[PDB]
Amino acid sequence: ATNRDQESSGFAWWAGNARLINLSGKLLGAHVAHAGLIVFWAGAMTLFELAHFIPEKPMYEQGLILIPHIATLGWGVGPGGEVVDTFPFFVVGVVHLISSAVLGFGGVYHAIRGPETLEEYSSFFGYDWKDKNKMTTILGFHLIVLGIGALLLVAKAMFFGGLYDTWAPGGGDVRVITNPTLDPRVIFGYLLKSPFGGEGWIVSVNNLEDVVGGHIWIGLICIAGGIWHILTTPFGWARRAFIWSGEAYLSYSLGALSMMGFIATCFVWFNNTVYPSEFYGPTGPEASQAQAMTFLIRDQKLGANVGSAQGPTGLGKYLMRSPTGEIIFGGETMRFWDFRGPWLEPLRGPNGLDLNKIKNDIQPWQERRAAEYMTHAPLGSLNSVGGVATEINSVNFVSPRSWLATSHFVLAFFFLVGHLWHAGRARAAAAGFEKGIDRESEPVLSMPSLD
Amino acid sequence: MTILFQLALAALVILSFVMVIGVPVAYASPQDWDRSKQLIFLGSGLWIALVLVVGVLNFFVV
Amino acid sequence: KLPEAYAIFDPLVDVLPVIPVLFLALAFVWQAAVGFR
Amino acid sequence: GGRIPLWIVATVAGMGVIVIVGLFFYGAYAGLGSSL
């Protein structure tokens, strides 16, 4: 066995995948077999989700996370997000599950049967980690693949059925996007938006014309930079900036993935556009806004004048002003006055929540939505007891938004730790002291004392 | 047909169980590799055919 | 529910998603068989 | 002395641990203590 023990490889069993750093044939097989694990799970989970799925229950009541991802794409859903057909979920699960036997085969093949190194067999599929031009070429190859993937979403939205649109007028529906936002002041304007409250950076994207036109821009940028990296070598400022080794490139992707996981955690928590509340449940802000709506509606039905009702503190019990003066829901939900959702936006005038609209124009579908969202707030226990920590056992609910945000916080945190681990190790390995201090030339011993 | 669907699926499920065990043991026993490769080549194309057969016979049993 | 032709395979579909965890543990069976060398 | 290989012993013992603890988590959703 070449490199499959600690004496020959330098790495113990518990760091045994580091024995593959300079074995590109087996290292390719590790990646292809692991790609098959991802695709296996995407297929197996979907079939599990579909086999447990009740179409007359909402998706968010059923512990589903992958069916809502398919439904948001426009597949299998009708107006308001009701499931009109379970066959697209069955196709997406089956095709992933079959394809993972394919990726599993070539992963197993390259990792046990194929050549341990690809360099002798092929100059095109071989690489040195230190060959900067080969590194940018493969980077360019994968950038093109990702840009085409972003245009696949555009093609779904424009030419192959559309996407589910929670903001579609007259209630949410699958809608073909015809005029995506191509204006770069809007698309790149989200990049300069503050991440703080009321702004929210890219998480604030609130319409599918911005989502589709952004993916047009991303798909063309990734194809352009793909072609750019195939046809260039890193400039001297980048050569003197970075560490050029496999562990270093891993660490850059680790920091990149950690940053993206934190972003997705905030996406699923706050955004009800690309994570529609009919599929994922109400957001945290949404349900708190929906409780204030529920008790405004009930008490105003009893005869209360909700605009003039003073709470215990002297703020309005139902309605109050935000610090810039917009009319907002009172109580603790004053913090969530930046929430925007299709059940609430009909009540909102130019200066905020309109008292005349609130008195007259609250439809029964809004009252049903407010009560349903208030009672499906993303709060629950680890054993999936719905509601506050003091609630009794009965309701079996943890919102998908809570599952998706918490999982991706954990993953993004540990990926930041992995970034720090591998980036520090790659620097020490390139500078040559990752195995410790040379006793015969210890650096501090030739530095002057601090005092 | 209808029996020819749940037969062909359970033939696919059984053959995948022989490919999941039988492929890594054949790849990692380089003793009798030559007779394993035709067995691998055969079961590979038989697996791809049964998937296509189940996928076509999906639509007659709905 | 899965399409009703596939409902025989309902026990098997119920155990499919955990199969990736078994690959993580299989790496330890294999390392134990080679003595964690 | 060394007739059953220790990796086989560890795997069977490790799997029986999983099965027993897995039964304990099953019993959290059935019968006593399940709130139903």
Partner: peptide, 27 residues
């Protein structure tokens, strides 16, 4: 039903190892 499926799937992993161990495989 699920128990006998998981017991077969759970055996298939360690059976690959055990069979390769006794065929003097490239473990």
């Amino acid at each position: 039903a699920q128990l006998t499926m998981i017991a077969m799937i759970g055996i298939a992993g360690p059976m690959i190892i055990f069979l390769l161990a006794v065929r003097r495989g490239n473990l």
